[PDB]
Amino acid sequence: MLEIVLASQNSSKLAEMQELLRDLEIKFIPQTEFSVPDIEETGSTFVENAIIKARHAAKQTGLPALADDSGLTIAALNSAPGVFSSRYAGKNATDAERIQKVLEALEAADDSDRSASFHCVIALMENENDPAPLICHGVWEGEIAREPRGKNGFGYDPIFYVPSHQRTAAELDPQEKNAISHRGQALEQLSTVLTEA
Amino acid sequence: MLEIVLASQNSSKLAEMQELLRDLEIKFIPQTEFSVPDIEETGSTFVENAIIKARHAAKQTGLPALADDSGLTIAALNSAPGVFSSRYAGKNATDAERIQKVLEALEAADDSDRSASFHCVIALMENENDPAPLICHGVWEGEIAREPRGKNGFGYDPIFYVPSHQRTAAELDPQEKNAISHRGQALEQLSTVLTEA
Ligand SMILES: [Ca+2]
Ligand SMILES: [Ca+2]
Numbered sequence: 001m002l003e004i005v006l007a008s009q010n011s012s013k014l015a016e017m018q019e020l021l022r023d024l025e026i027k028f029i030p031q032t033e034f035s036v037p038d039i040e041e042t043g044s045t046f047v048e049n050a051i052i053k054a055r056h057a058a059k060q061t062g063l064p065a066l067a068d069d070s071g072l073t074i075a076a077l078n079s080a081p082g083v084f085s086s087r088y089a090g091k092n093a094t095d096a097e098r099i100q101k102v103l104e105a106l107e108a109a110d111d112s113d114r115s116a117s118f119h120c121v122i123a124l125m126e127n128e129n130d131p132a133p134l135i136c137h138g139v140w141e142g143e144i145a146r147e148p149r150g151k152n153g154f155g156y157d158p159i160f161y162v163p164s165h166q167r168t169a170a171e172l173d174p175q176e177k178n179a180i181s182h183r184g185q186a187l188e189q190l191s192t193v194l195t196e197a
Numbered sequence: 198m199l200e201i202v203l204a205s206q207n208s209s210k211l212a213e214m215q216e217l218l219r220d221l222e223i224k225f226i227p228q229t230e231f232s233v234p235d236i237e238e239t240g241s242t243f244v245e246n247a248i249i250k251a252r253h254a255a256k257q258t259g260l261p262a263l264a265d266d267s268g269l270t271i272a273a274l275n276s277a278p279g280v281f282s283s284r285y286a287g288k289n290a291t292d293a294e295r296i297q298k299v300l301e302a303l304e305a306a307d308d309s310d311r312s313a314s315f316h317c318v319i320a321l322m323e324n325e326n327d328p329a330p331l332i333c334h335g336v337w338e339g340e341i342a343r344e345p346r347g348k349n350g351f352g353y354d355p356i357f358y359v360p361s362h363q364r365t366a367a368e369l370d371p372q373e374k375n376a377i378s379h380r381g382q383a384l385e386q387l388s389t390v391l392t393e394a
Contacts (some may be wrong), residue, residue: 043331046328048248079327133242
């Protein structure tokens with residue numbers, strides 16, 4: 001049984017992964033099971049943070065490690081909030097607060113372009129010295145709505161309008177969102193590689 | 198016309214690029230046309246270094262920038278020389294010196310497994326603050342020979358045995374190498390993306 005450490009403490013991320021690779025002989029183990037502490041994300045790109053976290057987990061555990069970083073990028077805001085997606089409305093802020101700051105920022109930029117994208121970058125390291133980690137990059141293109149809509153999901157989901165569905169991410173059923181999202185796409189890229197291996 | 202800064206002083210890499218995207222309305226400008234000072238690669242992965250270089254070029258020039266990092270990974274040496282491929286026997290060591298160093302490292306490891314692979318990671322940054330650069334990753338699988346052979350190529354080519362061709366990279370005609378190498382693959386990925394864009 002191939003053992004891979006998951007850097008994330010996020011339970012939904014682990015569950016999504018187990019579901020994804022259910023037919024493969026691979027076992028994901030949260031880094032917390034090795035008492036690995038979180039490491040600070042200091043990169044300016046998702047890929048840099050994904051690597052930082054995977055390399056850390058691999059270093060401490062001695063096993064292969066997989067990490068991801070994700071965020072919302074808005075064209076009119078020069079790709080902000082980007083890697084500051086979680087920090088966009090200050091520390092200790094809520095999802096609702098962050099949504100409002102994004103809406104205000106666009107309002108202030110008064111730029112007709114509401115284009116935006118969700119990104120998920122997964123990095124898989126064989127060990128901490130791996131110079132060529134597997135990189136999977138999922139991209140989900142949409143638009144920022146004028147006001148929050150939808151009961152599902154989390155974070156910026158309520159203002160992420162999905163043109164193909166004429167609904168926001170928060171309006172989609174969970175399964176449908178997870179099938180077409182930036183995470184879904186990254187995960188399918190990962191599965192293709194792992195399955196082939 | 199779209200202008201992209203190439204963060205490389207290598208004339209062959211520029212020529213290969215122009216040749217590759219000859220049908221596209223893109224002009225590649227070497228960073229030397231902007232007097233960009235070279236920056237130090239501090240990453241432990243090719244992708245990290247490509248991003249460093251691309252980010253630097255974009256910041257200094259104000260234009261989108263493309264960069265690459267490349268190396269040889271040898272399984273018996275835990276993926277070494279890896280990101281130190283261009284530093285393996287000293288910053289000023291000749292290609293011949295590095296080859297000998299690799300051969301010596303291998304015979305010291307006493308591992309019947311001579312599996313190795315060339316890597317080329319390309320990163321394209323819209324600007325210095327781009328959190329989601331395009332990453333193209335070309336991989337070329339082969340093995341390390343026991344002695345150098347072949348009149349073509351450069352660097353580690355004389356000891357990169359290519360099972361599919363029963364020759365080293367240096368023995369291949371230049372056009373054949375370029376069609377199958379880690380760089381050729383990375384460039385084809387870039388071209389697909391840029392063309393469809
Ligand atoms: Ca993050
Ligand atoms: Ca280099």
